[PDB]
Amino acid sequence: ASDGLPNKKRKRRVLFTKAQTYELERRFRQQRYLSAPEREHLASLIRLTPTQVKIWFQNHRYKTKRAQNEKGYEGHP
């Protein structure tokens, strides 16, 4: 459901719920990038790891609205 899906694409995924997807998309509209004093505070506020938040903002800047998302695609980021 959150760590699994009945499809064949990617494999290994991340699939996050409505608190997690809310905060990540709302910084992706107003910002590009978010530095360590405020990025680690966003990960402690929402409850995730520093390495999964860092590579979420890495994979979202990658020509993303098609399945040509060549390096760093965890589903369809």
Short mmCIF file of N, CA, C and O in Angstrom, two decimals:
data_model
loop_
_atom_site.label_atom_id
_atom_site.label_comp_id
_atom_site.label_asym_id
_atom_site.label_seq_id
_atom_site.Cartn_x
_atom_site.Cartn_y
_atom_site.Cartn_z
N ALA A 1 0.84 -1.22 0.00
CA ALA A 1 0.00 0.00 0.00
C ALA A 1 0.85 1.24 0.00
O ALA A 1 0.69 2.11 -0.85
N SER A 2 1.80 1.33 0.97
CA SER A 2 2.74 2.43 1.17
C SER A 2 4.13 1.96 0.76
O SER A 2 4.94 2.75 0.28
N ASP A 3 4.41 0.65 0.96
CA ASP A 3 5.65 -0.01 0.58
C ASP A 3 5.23 -1.26 -0.16
O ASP A 3 5.40 -2.38 0.33
N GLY A 4 4.68 -1.07 -1.38
CA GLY A 4 4.20 -2.12 -2.25
C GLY A 4 3.15 -1.50 -3.12
O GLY A 4 2.58 -0.47 -2.77
N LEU A 5 2.86 -2.13 -4.28
CA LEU A 5 1.87 -1.67 -5.23
C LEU A 5 1.57 -2.85 -6.14
O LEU A 5 2.52 -3.58 -6.41
N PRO A 6 0.35 -3.15 -6.69
CA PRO A 6 0.15 -4.25 -7.64
C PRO A 6 0.31 -3.75 -9.08
O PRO A 6 -0.67 -3.74 -9.82
N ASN A 7 1.54 -3.34 -9.48
CA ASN A 7 1.86 -2.83 -10.80
C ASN A 7 3.26 -3.31 -11.08
O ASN A 7 3.88 -3.98 -10.26
N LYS A 8 3.78 -2.96 -12.29
CA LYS A 8 5.13 -3.27 -12.72
C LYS A 8 5.65 -2.03 -13.39
O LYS A 8 5.35 -1.76 -14.55
N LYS A 9 6.47 -1.25 -12.63
CA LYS A 9 7.13 -0.06 -13.10
C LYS A 9 8.36 0.07 -12.24
O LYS A 9 9.44 -0.37 -12.63
N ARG A 10 8.21 0.69 -11.04
CA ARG A 10 9.29 0.94 -10.10
C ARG A 10 8.66 0.89 -8.72
O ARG A 10 7.78 1.70 -8.43
N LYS A 11 9.10 -0.02 -7.80
CA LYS A 11 10.01 -1.15 -7.96
C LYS A 11 11.49 -0.80 -7.94
O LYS A 11 12.18 -1.14 -8.90
N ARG A 12 12.08 -0.11 -6.91
CA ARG A 12 11.66 0.30 -5.60
C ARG A 12 11.05 1.68 -5.60
O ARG A 12 11.68 2.66 -6.01
N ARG A 13 9.80 1.77 -5.08
CA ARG A 13 8.98 2.92 -4.86
C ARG A 13 9.24 3.64 -3.56
O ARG A 13 9.91 3.14 -2.66
N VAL A 14 8.63 4.84 -3.44
CA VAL A 14 8.12 5.43 -2.23
C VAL A 14 6.73 5.86 -2.59
O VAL A 14 6.49 6.43 -3.65
N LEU A 15 5.76 5.59 -1.68
CA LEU A 15 4.38 6.01 -1.83
C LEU A 15 3.95 6.49 -0.46
O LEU A 15 3.77 5.70 0.47
N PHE A 16 3.81 7.83 -0.34
CA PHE A 16 3.56 8.61 0.84
C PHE A 16 2.11 9.08 0.85
O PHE A 16 1.49 9.22 -0.20
N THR A 17 1.55 9.35 2.08
CA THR A 17 0.16 9.72 2.35
C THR A 17 0.00 11.23 2.45
O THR A 17 0.93 11.96 2.13
N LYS A 18 -1.22 11.72 2.83
CA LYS A 18 -1.74 13.07 2.56
C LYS A 18 -1.20 14.21 3.40
O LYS A 18 -1.44 15.37 3.06
N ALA A 19 -0.42 13.93 4.48
CA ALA A 19 0.38 14.89 5.23
C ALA A 19 1.74 15.14 4.58
O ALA A 19 2.22 16.28 4.48
N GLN A 20 2.37 14.03 4.08
CA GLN A 20 3.70 13.92 3.54
C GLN A 20 3.78 14.50 2.14
O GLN A 20 4.67 15.29 1.83
N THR A 21 2.77 14.18 1.28
CA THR A 21 2.59 14.61 -0.11
C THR A 21 2.16 16.08 -0.21
O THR A 21 2.49 16.76 -1.18
N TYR A 22 1.48 16.61 0.86
CA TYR A 22 1.02 17.99 1.04
C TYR A 22 2.18 18.96 1.21
O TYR A 22 2.26 19.96 0.49
N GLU A 23 3.10 18.66 2.17
CA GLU A 23 4.25 19.51 2.52
C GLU A 23 5.38 19.54 1.50
O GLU A 23 6.00 20.58 1.29
N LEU A 24 5.63 18.39 0.81
CA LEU A 24 6.65 18.22 -0.23
C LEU A 24 6.33 18.90 -1.55
O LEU A 24 7.21 19.51 -2.16
N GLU A 25 5.05 18.84 -2.01
CA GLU A 25 4.53 19.55 -3.17
C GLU A 25 4.37 21.05 -2.99
O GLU A 25 4.50 21.80 -3.96
N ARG A 26 4.08 21.54 -1.74
CA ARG A 26 3.88 22.95 -1.43
C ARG A 26 5.15 23.77 -1.31
O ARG A 26 5.16 24.96 -1.59
N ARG A 27 6.28 23.09 -0.93
CA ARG A 27 7.64 23.62 -1.08
C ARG A 27 8.17 23.49 -2.50
O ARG A 27 9.02 24.28 -2.90
N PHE A 28 7.71 22.50 -3.33
CA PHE A 28 8.13 22.31 -4.73
C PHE A 28 7.55 23.35 -5.71
O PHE A 28 8.08 23.54 -6.81
N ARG A 29 6.46 24.07 -5.31
CA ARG A 29 5.83 25.17 -6.06
C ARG A 29 6.53 26.51 -5.82
O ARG A 29 6.79 27.23 -6.78
N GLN A 30 6.85 26.88 -4.54
CA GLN A 30 7.39 28.14 -4.11
C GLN A 30 8.92 28.14 -4.08
O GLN A 30 9.53 29.21 -4.16
N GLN A 31 9.58 26.96 -3.95
CA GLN A 31 11.03 26.81 -3.85
C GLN A 31 11.48 25.83 -4.91
O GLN A 31 10.67 25.16 -5.55
N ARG A 32 12.82 25.73 -5.08
CA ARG A 32 13.54 24.69 -5.80
C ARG A 32 14.24 23.77 -4.82
O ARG A 32 14.32 22.56 -5.01
N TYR A 33 14.85 24.41 -3.79
CA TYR A 33 15.89 23.89 -2.93
C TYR A 33 15.63 24.45 -1.55
O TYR A 33 15.03 25.51 -1.40
N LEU A 34 16.06 23.70 -0.51
CA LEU A 34 15.83 23.97 0.88
C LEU A 34 17.03 23.38 1.58
O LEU A 34 17.32 22.19 1.46
N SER A 35 17.78 24.26 2.32
CA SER A 35 19.06 24.01 2.98
C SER A 35 18.86 23.38 4.35
O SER A 35 17.76 23.44 4.89
N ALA A 36 19.94 22.77 4.92
CA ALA A 36 20.01 21.93 6.12
C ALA A 36 19.39 22.40 7.44
O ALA A 36 18.81 21.55 8.11
N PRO A 37 19.39 23.68 7.90
CA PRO A 37 18.70 24.13 9.12
C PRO A 37 17.17 24.07 9.05
O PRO A 37 16.54 23.88 10.09
N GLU A 38 16.59 24.24 7.83
CA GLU A 38 15.17 24.19 7.53
C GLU A 38 14.69 22.91 6.84
O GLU A 38 13.49 22.63 6.87
N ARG A 39 15.59 22.06 6.24
CA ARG A 39 15.27 20.79 5.58
C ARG A 39 15.17 19.64 6.58
O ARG A 39 14.32 18.76 6.44
N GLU A 40 16.04 19.64 7.63
CA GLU A 40 16.09 18.67 8.73
C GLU A 40 15.01 18.92 9.77
O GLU A 40 14.63 18.02 10.51
N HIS A 41 14.48 20.18 9.79
CA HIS A 41 13.39 20.67 10.60
C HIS A 41 12.04 20.30 10.01
O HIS A 41 11.07 20.12 10.74
N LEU A 42 11.98 20.15 8.65
CA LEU A 42 10.87 19.67 7.83
C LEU A 42 10.70 18.16 7.92
O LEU A 42 9.59 17.65 7.85
N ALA A 43 11.83 17.42 8.14
CA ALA A 43 11.92 15.97 8.31
C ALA A 43 11.60 15.52 9.73
O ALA A 43 11.15 14.41 9.93
N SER A 44 11.83 16.41 10.74
CA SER A 44 11.46 16.23 12.13
C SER A 44 10.04 16.64 12.43
O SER A 44 9.42 16.13 13.37
N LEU A 45 9.48 17.57 11.61
CA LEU A 45 8.12 18.08 11.64
C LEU A 45 7.12 17.09 11.06
O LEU A 45 6.01 16.97 11.56
N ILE A 46 7.52 16.36 9.98
CA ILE A 46 6.65 15.47 9.23
C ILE A 46 6.90 14.01 9.55
O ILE A 46 6.01 13.19 9.34
N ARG A 47 8.12 13.66 10.08
CA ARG A 47 8.58 12.36 10.56
C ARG A 47 9.10 11.45 9.46
O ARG A 47 8.49 10.43 9.15
N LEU A 48 10.27 11.81 8.86
CA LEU A 48 10.98 10.97 7.91
C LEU A 48 12.46 11.10 8.20
O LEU A 48 12.87 11.72 9.19
N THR A 49 13.31 10.50 7.31
CA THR A 49 14.77 10.47 7.34
C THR A 49 15.30 11.62 6.47
O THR A 49 14.67 11.95 5.45
N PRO A 50 16.49 12.21 6.79
CA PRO A 50 17.22 13.19 5.98
C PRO A 50 17.63 12.75 4.57
O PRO A 50 17.80 13.62 3.72
N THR A 51 17.78 11.42 4.30
CA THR A 51 18.27 10.88 3.04
C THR A 51 17.13 10.65 2.05
O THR A 51 17.36 10.74 0.84
N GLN A 52 15.87 10.38 2.52
CA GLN A 52 14.71 10.19 1.67
C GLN A 52 14.08 11.50 1.24
O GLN A 52 13.58 11.60 0.12
N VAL A 53 14.16 12.57 2.11
CA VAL A 53 13.77 13.95 1.78
C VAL A 53 14.70 14.63 0.77
O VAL A 53 14.23 15.25 -0.19
N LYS A 54 16.06 14.45 0.92
CA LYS A 54 17.11 14.93 0.02
C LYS A 54 17.03 14.40 -1.41
O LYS A 54 17.12 15.17 -2.36
N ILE A 55 16.81 13.06 -1.57
CA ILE A 55 16.64 12.40 -2.86
C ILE A 55 15.22 12.45 -3.42
O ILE A 55 15.02 12.08 -4.57
N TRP A 56 14.19 12.96 -2.65
CA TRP A 56 12.86 13.34 -3.16
C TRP A 56 12.92 14.61 -4.01
O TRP A 56 12.31 14.67 -5.07
N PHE A 57 13.69 15.64 -3.54
CA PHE A 57 13.90 16.93 -4.23
C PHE A 57 14.92 16.86 -5.35
O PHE A 57 14.95 17.74 -6.20
N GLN A 58 15.75 15.78 -5.38
CA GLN A 58 16.68 15.41 -6.45
C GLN A 58 15.97 14.78 -7.65
O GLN A 58 16.34 15.03 -8.80
N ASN A 59 14.93 13.93 -7.38
CA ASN A 59 14.21 13.13 -8.36
C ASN A 59 13.04 13.87 -8.99
O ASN A 59 12.57 13.49 -10.06
N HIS A 60 12.55 14.97 -8.34
CA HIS A 60 11.46 15.83 -8.79
C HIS A 60 11.87 16.88 -9.83
O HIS A 60 11.03 17.30 -10.63
N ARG A 61 13.16 17.32 -9.85
CA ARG A 61 13.81 18.17 -10.86
C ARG A 61 14.38 17.38 -12.05
O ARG A 61 15.55 17.57 -12.38
N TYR A 62 13.61 16.46 -12.72
CA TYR A 62 14.17 15.51 -13.65
C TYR A 62 13.23 15.24 -14.79
O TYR A 62 12.99 14.08 -15.12
N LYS A 63 12.69 16.31 -15.45
CA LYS A 63 11.88 16.30 -16.71
C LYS A 63 10.62 15.43 -16.65
O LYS A 63 10.36 14.57 -17.50
N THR A 64 9.87 15.62 -15.53
CA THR A 64 9.21 14.56 -14.76
C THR A 64 7.84 14.10 -15.22
O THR A 64 7.42 13.01 -14.84
N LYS A 65 7.10 14.93 -16.02
CA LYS A 65 5.73 14.69 -16.47
C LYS A 65 5.64 13.85 -17.74
O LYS A 65 4.98 14.23 -18.71
N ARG A 66 6.29 12.66 -17.70
CA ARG A 66 6.31 11.60 -18.69
C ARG A 66 7.16 10.54 -18.03
O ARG A 66 7.77 10.79 -16.99
N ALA A 67 7.25 9.31 -18.62
CA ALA A 67 8.05 8.20 -18.11
C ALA A 67 9.47 8.18 -18.63
O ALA A 67 10.18 7.18 -18.49
N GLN A 68 9.93 9.33 -19.19
CA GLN A 68 11.32 9.66 -19.43
C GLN A 68 11.80 10.46 -18.25
O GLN A 68 11.81 11.69 -18.23
N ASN A 69 12.18 9.68 -17.22
CA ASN A 69 12.67 10.11 -15.93
C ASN A 69 13.78 9.12 -15.66
O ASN A 69 13.69 8.27 -14.78
N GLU A 70 14.85 9.23 -16.48
CA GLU A 70 16.02 8.36 -16.61
C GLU A 70 16.84 7.94 -15.37
O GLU A 70 16.91 6.73 -15.13
N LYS A 71 17.47 8.83 -14.53
CA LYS A 71 18.19 8.43 -13.33
C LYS A 71 17.49 9.08 -12.17
O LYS A 71 17.34 10.30 -12.12
N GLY A 72 17.04 8.24 -11.20
CA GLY A 72 16.33 8.61 -10.00
C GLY A 72 14.84 8.71 -10.23
O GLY A 72 14.29 9.81 -10.23
N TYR A 73 14.16 7.55 -10.43
CA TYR A 73 12.76 7.40 -10.60
C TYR A 73 12.33 6.24 -9.76
O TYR A 73 12.66 5.08 -9.99
N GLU A 74 11.57 6.62 -8.72
CA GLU A 74 10.92 5.85 -7.68
C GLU A 74 9.43 5.95 -7.88
O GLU A 74 8.73 6.59 -7.09
N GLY A 75 8.91 5.32 -8.97
CA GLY A 75 7.52 5.33 -9.39
C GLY A 75 7.37 6.28 -10.54
O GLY A 75 7.71 5.95 -11.68
N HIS A 76 6.88 7.50 -10.24
CA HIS A 76 6.78 8.62 -11.16
C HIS A 76 6.94 9.85 -10.28
O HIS A 76 5.92 10.40 -9.85
N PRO A 77 8.15 10.33 -9.96
CA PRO A 77 8.36 11.47 -9.08
C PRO A 77 8.22 12.75 -9.89
O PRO A 77 7.06 13.19 -10.13
#
